[PDB]
Design a protein around this ligand. Structure first.
Ligand SMILES: NC(=O)C[C@H](N)C(=O)O
Ligand SMILES: NC(=O)C[C@H](N)C(=O)O
Ligand SMILES: [Cl-]
Ligand SMILES: [Cl-]
Ligand SMILES: [Cl-]
Ligand SMILES: [Cl-]
Ligand SMILES: [Cl-]
Ligand SMILES: [Cl-]
Ligand SMILES: [Cl-]
Lengths: 131, 130
């Protein structure tokens, strides 16, 4: 039953203790990136993503955040890059997160070229409402 | 400015409101999987992963959780499948999370075939002690 002291970053009303190590370029990521560099390959993938996004929308109640990302032809990696976000954080936005800050909605809206309302409406499909 | 009521799942002292839909196959995931189905390709990638894992360990103080995963030749997808975990949760384990439940450490230790201590020591490299 021990105690140990760790250095943490306090940056404007927010504590950051965890330092996730950041080597963006991993072989699997590197691979898909090279595959998508061919426009003919990219399209083939895109059409598959769209078809799968339909199955997601129907299954889930309507357009989800992932669903929408897929129909616009963005891999999670591509969208993360387009929207000035880290991919881990984007993964959380697609799967785990309960809300989005306004600034993020806008970054994402711009990246995908759709309205804030669209982004927000998609995000909110992870819930089950009742009226 | 109204109020909208949402249905949430309460399951043994834990609330689950968010439903992240799960059809497990996307084209990018599908692609790498097929690429890794060739053992000759898998190896080429594995050797690259290991080399990159070295740069990670040196940069970061020692073996990190990602580092370790890479040296054993597991893509995040592969390790998530091997350890009976969801890949979103695994991504959070590698990047965001502050601790691991004992049950998880064990699931992971088994998947990678290393000790709990190794898993734990790796995870703890995301901090700066003194
Ligand atoms: N999250 C962090 O990076 C905190 C760390 N102690 C630092 O050097 O800033
Ligand atoms: N997220 C889940 O696992 C289920 C969801 N909480 C529901 O509405 O039942
Ligand atoms: Cl693109
Ligand atoms: Cl989260
Ligand atoms: Cl809006
Ligand atoms: Cl009601
Ligand atoms: Cl009900
Ligand atoms: Cl994809
Ligand atoms: Cl990898």
């Amino acid at each position: 039953i021990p105690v140990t002291h760790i250095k943490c970053l306090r940056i404007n009303g927010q504590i950051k203790c965890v330092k996730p190590i950041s080597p963006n370029t991993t072989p699997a990521a590197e691979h898909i990136e090279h595959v998508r560099k061919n426009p003919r390959r990219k399209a083939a993938m895109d059409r598959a993503a769209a078809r799968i996004a339909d199955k997601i929308a129907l299954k889930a109640g309507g357009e989800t955040f992932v669903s929408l990302r897929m129909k616009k032809g963005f891999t999670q990696s591509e969208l993360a890059t387009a929207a000035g976000l880290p991919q881990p954080y984007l993964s959380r936005i697609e799967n785990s997160k309960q809300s989005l800050q306004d600034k993020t909605v806008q970054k994402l809206a711009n990246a995908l070229g759709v309205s804030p309302l669209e982004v927000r409406a998609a995000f909110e499909r992870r819930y089950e409402y009742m009226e």
